[PDB]
Amino acid sequence: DLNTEGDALYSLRQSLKDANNVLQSWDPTLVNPCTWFHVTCNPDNSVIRVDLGNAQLSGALVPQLGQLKNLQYLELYSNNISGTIPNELGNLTNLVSLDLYLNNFTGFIPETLGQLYKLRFLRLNNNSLSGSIPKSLTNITTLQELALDTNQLKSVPDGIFDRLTSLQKIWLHTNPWDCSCPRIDYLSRWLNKNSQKEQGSAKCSGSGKPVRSIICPTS
Ligand SMILES: *[C@@H]1O[C@H](CO)[C@@H](O)[C@H](O)[C@H]1NC(C)=O
Numbered sequence: 287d288l289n290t291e292g293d294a295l296y297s298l299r300q301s302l303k304d305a306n307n308v309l310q311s312w313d314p315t316l317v318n319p320c321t322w323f324h325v326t327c328n329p330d331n332s333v334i335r336v337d338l339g340n341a342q343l344s345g346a347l348v349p350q351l352g353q354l355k356n357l358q359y360l361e362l363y364s365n366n367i368s369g370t371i372p373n374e375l376g377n378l379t380n381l382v383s384l385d386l387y388l389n390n391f392t393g394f395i396p397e398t399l400g401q402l403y404k405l406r407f408l409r410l411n412n413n414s415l416s417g418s419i420p421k422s423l424t425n426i427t428t429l430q431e432l433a434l435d436t437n438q439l440k441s442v443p444d445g446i447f448d449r450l451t452s453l454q455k456i457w458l459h460t461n462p463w464d465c466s467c468p469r470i471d472y473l474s475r476w477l478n479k480n481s482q483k484e485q486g487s488a489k490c491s492g493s494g495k496p497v498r499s500i501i502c503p504t505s
Pocket residue numbers: 352353354355374377
């Protein structure tokens with residue numbers, strides 16, 4: 287009897303590279319993945335988390351990874367993983383902490399990420415992700431720590447941080463932010479009002495000025 291969490295998780299092993307044989311213990315033929323290393327299950331024998339951090343893993347993620355609904359913590363951080371973040375990660379409803387940081391990830395940040403309403407922690411940082419933030423992120427009210435730092439990020443949608451009332455720490459620094467007015471108006475004002483929330487200094491592109499220091503004129 288196939289597990290379907292194990293099948294979903296094995297689809298990841300097929301597309302990744304170790305080379306440390308980290309995933310050697312992932313056997314889909316077992317009744318459940320709960321006995322796998324780097325995998326933890328609840329008393330109901332479903333996968334609530336995956337810690338692959340620092341496994342020296344290369345390759346790309348897979349859309350089948352969204353098949354784990356009870357997945358709470360996904361730690362993929364500190365690897366060589368490339369490609370784009372799958373939209374199917376928006377199908378993890380019970381996802382609390384999503385850590386993709388310190389990887390090669392390219393492309394846009396998925397808009398379906400705004401479908402995680404239990405997500406309290408999002409770290410996409412130290413990646414190649416290209417500039418914008420999904421407007422749907424405002425739908426995460428439980429967001430506390432958001433780290434986007436060290437990426438290709440450029441702009442931000444107006445009023446996106448307004449519905450995040452639980453936001454504590456945020457990392458926007460080391461990004462090619464567009465400080466031209468009146469695009470940078472919201473972010474500059476938000477980073478100044480919320481400056482206790484920001485960790486590090488977000489610098490404007492080519493000027494080197496902090497985003498918060500920018501004051502946009504009307505007319
Ligand atoms: C989302 O997950 C549920 C259960 O985990 C599954 O039944 C459904 O097909 C998934 N949908 C997509 C689009 O992945």
